[PDB]
Paper text:
The trimeric spike glycoprotein (GP) on the viral surface is responsible for attachment and entry into the target cell. The stalk region of GP2 connects the globular body of GP to the viral or cell membrane and is the most C-terminal section of GP that has been visualized to high resolution. The antibody BDBV223 was identified in a human survivor of the 2007 BDBV outbreak in Uganda and targets the GP2 stalk. Here we describe two crystal structures of BDBV223: one alone, and one in complex with a synthetic peptide corresponding to its BDBV GP stalk epitope, at 2.0 and 3.7 Å resolution, respectively.
Crystals of the BDBV223-GP2 stalk complex diffracted at SSRL 12–2 to 3.7 Å resolution, and crystals of the unbound Fab fragment diffracted at APS 23-ID-D to 2.0 Å. Two Fab-peptide complexes are in the asymmetric unit of the complex, and one Fab is in the asymmetric unit of the apo-Fab structure. Although the arrangement of light chain CDRs of the BDBV223 Fab is similar in the apo- and peptide-bound structures, positions of each of the CDRs H1, H2, and H3 significantly shift upon binding the BDBV GP stalk epitope. The most prominent rearrangement upon BDBV223 Fab binding to the GP stalk peptide, however, occurs in CDR H3. The ordered portion of CDR H3 in the unbound structure adopts a different trajectory compared with the peptide-bound structure. Upon peptide binding, the loop re-orients towards the light chain by ~5.6 Å at the base (measured from the Cα of I99; the tip is only ordered in the complex) and the CDR H3 stem loses its β-strand character and becomes kinked. These structural shifts illustrate a high degree of conformational flexibility in BDBV223 HCDRs that likely influences the binding energy and pathways by which antibodies such as BDBV223 are elicited against this region.
Author numbering:
A (entry chain A): 10 to 24, 27 to 72, 74 to 99, 107 to 110, 113 to 224
B (entry chain B): 1 to 214
The structure:
Amino acid sequence: GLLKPSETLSLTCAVGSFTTTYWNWIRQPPGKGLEWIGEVNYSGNANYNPSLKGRVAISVDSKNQFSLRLNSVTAADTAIYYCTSRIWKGDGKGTTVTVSSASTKGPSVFPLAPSSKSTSGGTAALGCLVKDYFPEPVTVSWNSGALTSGVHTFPAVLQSSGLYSLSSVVTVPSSSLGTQTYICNVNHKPSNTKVDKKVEPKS
Amino acid sequence: EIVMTQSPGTLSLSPGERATLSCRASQSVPRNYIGWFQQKPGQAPRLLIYGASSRAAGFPDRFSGSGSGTDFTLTITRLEPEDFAMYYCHQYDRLPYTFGQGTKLEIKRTVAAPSVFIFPPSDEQLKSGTASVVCLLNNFYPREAKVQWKVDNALQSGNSQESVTEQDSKDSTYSLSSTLTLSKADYEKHKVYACEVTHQGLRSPVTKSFNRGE
């Protein structure tokens, strides 16, 4: 799942016409394109991508499986890893891999509210800032799921500290900021952190 | 190696129309070992085409690939709402195997200017020694938008992070969130905090601001 920098990434996938079968590893970093890692025939002849200057090792083993071994990992190696075969290619799923020097931490939840009072008739925006958590998976709802319209929960960003930050907003009519309550429902299962945050503007 | 450039990069169409995606290789691809992958947000890449022309199982005959040498093409006839996604071209002919940068097939709609909101940092957070100022750009199209942070008219650079939502399933718009991060001291040392937004749907840039301490 997750591991620290300078450690060794090791994965294995299960396993036809072995003499003409090629086994490939590819990966996709978060929000980026697809990247080819290496290919291998049944004998053991090896080909890899130049960017991985020898830190990559792919071999097929007895057990019906083939492996991937990335040496001296970095935060740049954080990606979802896929393994495929080829005669015509093909093998979803995949394995999420996060390389980080951070520890598991629950998020702080802060209110997102306007500086000044809202003008009636128009639309008002409000929300929750879910800051400084690790690892990635955090979920947000509003009013226990009763409020879905106008809700925008944004993709998390990776801060320089190594911790993630996410914003969740909602736009509501201004003439209801006094008749309706708004609470963001934040759940970070990796740290068992559940927070209920009521956000209230004036008027 | 063989670099691959895809075009248009961003294709904006509507359901029922015809989509044509292009993949150009720097050098020729002899055995036509060309593959096309479809990928929706949060999902694994699904193999759509292999051998440049052979359609994979799971995809209707609306999808077809053709081409040879250095030019390859993916065609999607009679576009359906589930066809709009990211598309990658791939060559597995000459080592090292490479990928195209991708083409985003999005739903085209009328131009919509963003609704801009600004949020000051909370007292809660200010008690911790860090200040986050947030700017929201709500429901705009197209996706391209620019945010400039100003603190007492000083242009901020390298201290903000943005993220954008996927195209909305209802109104086909995008939303953007930007966060300016400052220390509490620096935050208290200044008064006017402004988010300035530029977008092709805006007649002129829209600035939302506030004064620390009102």
